[PDB]
Amino acid sequence: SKSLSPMPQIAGVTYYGDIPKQPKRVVSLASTYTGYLKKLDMNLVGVTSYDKKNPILAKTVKKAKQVAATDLEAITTLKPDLIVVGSTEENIKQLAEIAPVISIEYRKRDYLQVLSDFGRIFNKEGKAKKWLKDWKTKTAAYEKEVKAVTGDKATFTIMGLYEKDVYLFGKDWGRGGEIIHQAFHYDAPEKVKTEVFKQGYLSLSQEVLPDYIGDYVVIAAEDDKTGSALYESKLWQSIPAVKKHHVIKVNANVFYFTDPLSLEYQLETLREAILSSEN
């Protein structure tokens, strides 16, 4: 009985059932996408734990219930007309019995394309287009502002800390890489381009970190103590970028994401942090 989405065929997008064009009660089970749906003025009745822990996005979804993909009863009771999942979810069959499902395979469309793709699915092209135009202009302007500080050839490395582990990231695996490498067009060290960019991420032992850091490093973490032992180490303190105060420590609870709401916060945060590196 719902007016239907035109359900365009788009790389990475799979539809289960007849997707509504104008869903009124959306459950997002994919934190990668929740804020895209919010930007397009969807009514989110269910979101994920990650969404509730995202201090920027959470402010806009207070009325949504936190749910996990296993919460068949809670999701049913929310009476959704659309469920959104990532393609690695394992109970899509059961979810699609509750409501139509859109399943997205990560990385098939880039962080900007995802928004315009949802614009086509929901006939919200104008909202997507306006946001994307503003983003293009603003990021070009900000690229000039930050390269006025660093120079145009400065290298950046994206890093994240989790538990006792260290990771590097490329241009399209979160942690600020989309803004640093795609929006600001900062280069990365050669070793990062060669070893990290294709896969998107790389597990590293701490002792080799100096070899992967050039001018600047952006480091994501979920709490301000995860990195404490690393930061006090002689190894870390030996790195030229560290000596120069070219370390930018960011809050992973928002910096994991690439939705428009998270990005707006990240963009201003990174712009200000690059300026502040020269205080």
Please give the residue ranges that form the binding site for Na ion (CB under 5 A): 272, 275
Between the CA atoms of 256, 259, 261 and 263, what dihedral angle is there, to the nearest 10 degrees? 60
Q: Give the type of residue at 247.
A: V
Report yes or no: 65 and 49 within 8 Å, Cβ to Cβ. Answer: no
CB of 66 to Cl ion, least distance (A): 22
Chain residue whose CB lies nearest Zn ion: 185
- Joined together, the tokens standing for residue 213 give 């850091």
If residue 168 lies in a helix (H) or strand (E), which one and from where to where? strand 165-169
Nearer to Cl ion, 118 or 142 (CB): 142
Which of Na ion, Cl ion, Zn ion, none sits in contact with 185, Cβ below 5 to 8 A by type? Answer: Zn ion
Sheet holding 26-28, edge to edge: 13-16, 101-104, 82-86, 26-28, 44-47, 65-66
Q: Examine residue 251 and tell whether it contacts Cl ion (CB under 5 A).
A: yes
Q: Examine residue 19 and tell whether it contacts Cl ion (CB under 5 A).
A: no
Nearer to Cl ion, 125 or 268 (CB): 268
Q: Examine residue 185 and tell whether it contacts Zn ion (CB under 5 A).
A: yes
197: three-class secondary structure by DSSP: coil
Which of Na ion, Cl ion, Zn ion, none sits in contact with 230, Cβ below 5 to 8 A by type? Answer: none
Which of Zn ion, Cl ion, Na ion, none sits in contact with 154, Cβ below 5 to 8 A by type? Answer: none
Q: Is 105 annotated as a binding residue?
A: no
CA 41/CA 43 separation, integer angstroms: 6
Which of Zn ion, Na ion, Cl ion, none sits in contact with 251, Cβ below 5 to 8 A by type? Answer: Cl ion
- Please provide the DSSP assignment of 69-87 as one string: TT-HHHHHHT--SEEEEET
Q: Is 181 annotated as a binding residue?
A: no
Nearer to Zn ion, 73 or 268 (CB): 73
Contacts with Cl ion, residue ranges (CB under 5 A): 250-251
Query: Residues comprising the binding site for Zn(2+)?
Result: 18, 73, 90, 97, 143, 165, 185, 222, 232, 245-246, 278
